[PDB]
Amino acid sequence: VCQEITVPMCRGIGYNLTHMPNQFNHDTQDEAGLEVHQFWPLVEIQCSPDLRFFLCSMYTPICLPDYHKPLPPCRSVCERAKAGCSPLMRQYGFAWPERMSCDRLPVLGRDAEVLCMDY
Amino acid sequence: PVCQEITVPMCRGIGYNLTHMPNQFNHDTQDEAGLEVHQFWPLVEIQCSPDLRFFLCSMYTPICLPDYHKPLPPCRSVCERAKAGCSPLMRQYGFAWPERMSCDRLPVLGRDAEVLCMDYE
Ligand SMILES: *[C@@H]1O[C@H](CO[C@@H]2O[C@@H](C)[C@@H](O)[C@@H](O)[C@@H]2O)[C@@H](O[C@@H]2O[C@@H](C)[C@@H](O)[C@@H](O)[C@@H]2O)[C@H](O[C@@H]2O[C@@H](C)[C@@H](O)[C@@H](O)[C@@H]2O)[C@H]1NC(C)=O
Ligand SMILES: CCCCCC/C=C/CCCCCCCC(=O)O
Ligand SMILES: CCCCCC/C=C/CCCCCCCC(=O)O
């Protein structure tokens, strides 16, 4: 079933409801939220206007009551966030996370049946 | 008085390095100011708005310029972005958007050419 998002940084990004487990197999929003919290300095610095939405689209993925297919962000969302933010991360010794590699995400409109989220 | 370097930890590295006491809250010291603005620190880590830190610091540790010799407020638009981002969460958690940082107390950028204000990013 769908639950109201309780991860504070992921409220106000365009949708209200999520469902667990997410694609990292976090079992609760609490677990997901403790991890995504670590990205707050990157979000504050605004290296990319897509980052916040992108992070939330994976940590608290959108839930629709009638839809049971997973709705990842589109690859393009990831690409923009990565292009904006990875240089700054690299500058702090952080590589772009392995679990966030964009090639794992569907391309917008490539497959009619495979929907995804574009900001 | 007096153009002093900013010591409040939250407000270091926000884009200007100097402030002046007292502020609009009648804090006589940065230590007094810091104790209050640091109560908002969890909201900064929550990142309901990227503009929140700058907006708060522009109030509590206002910019001091050796060339202006008067207070320089954030533009209304800075407040409006912080508030649009963070008011919903503050209201949900039971904390009203405080009246001291009402956006209608701030100048709209360029509405009167002689009334300056700081915008950012
Ligand atoms: C997204 O959620 C908004 C907040 O809902 C409230 O908080 C959540 C966490 C739950 O506890 C809900 O049970 C609460 O209603 C919701 O907006 C609210 O709507 C009214 C009742 C009032 O509380 C407002 O202050 C809230 O913002 C959103 O609902 C949409 O937008 C609002 C502005 C109205 O127009 C609604 O009709 C809309 O559906 C909701 N968004 C969606 C798409 O459901
Ligand atoms: C911890 C407070 C840092 C504040 C300074 C602002 C600089 C931010 C850029 C560095 C981002 C920190 C890494 C976040 C990503 C991660 O932890 O995996
Ligand atoms: C970082 C330690 C505290 C973590 C506890 C989480 C609390 C979150 C409350 C959200 C922000 C509250 C804003 C208070 C504003 C005010 O003091 O008027």
Four-point Cα dihedral A8, A11, A13, A15, nearest 10: 140
Runs of H (alpha helix) within A1-119: 29-36, 40-44, 51-59, 75-91
Could you say which residues from 53 to 72 on chain B have a Cβ atom under 8 Å away from some Cβ of chain A? 53
- Among protein residues, the one with the nearest Cα to ligand 1's atom 3 is A16
Which CATH class name applies to A1-119? mainly alpha
Encoded amino acid at A86, one letter: S
Partner B contacted by A21 (CB < 8 A): no
Q: How far apart are CA A12 and CA B88, in angstroms?
A: 8
User: What type of residue is B53?
Assistant: R
**A34 in contact with chain B, both atoms CB, cutoff 8 A:** no
Residue A100: CB within 6 Å of ligand 2?
Answer: no
Find the CB nearest A9 among B46, B53, B88: B46
In chain A, what are the domain boundaries? 1-119
Dist. CA A61–CA A19, nearest whole Å: 7
Q: Which of B111, B113, B119 minimizes the C-alpha distance to B81?
A: B119
Closest by CA position to A34, among listed A53, A3, A1, A9:
A9
Report the gap between the CA of A69 and the closest CA in chain B (Å): 28
Confirm if B75 and B107 have CB atoms less than 8 A apart. Answer: yes
The CATH class given to the B1-121 domain equals: mainly alpha
Q: Determine which helix (DSSP H) or strand (DSSP E) holds B77, and give its type and residue range.
A: helix B76-93
A5, A15, A16: residue to mutate for ligand 1 pocket, most atoms within 8 A of CB: A16
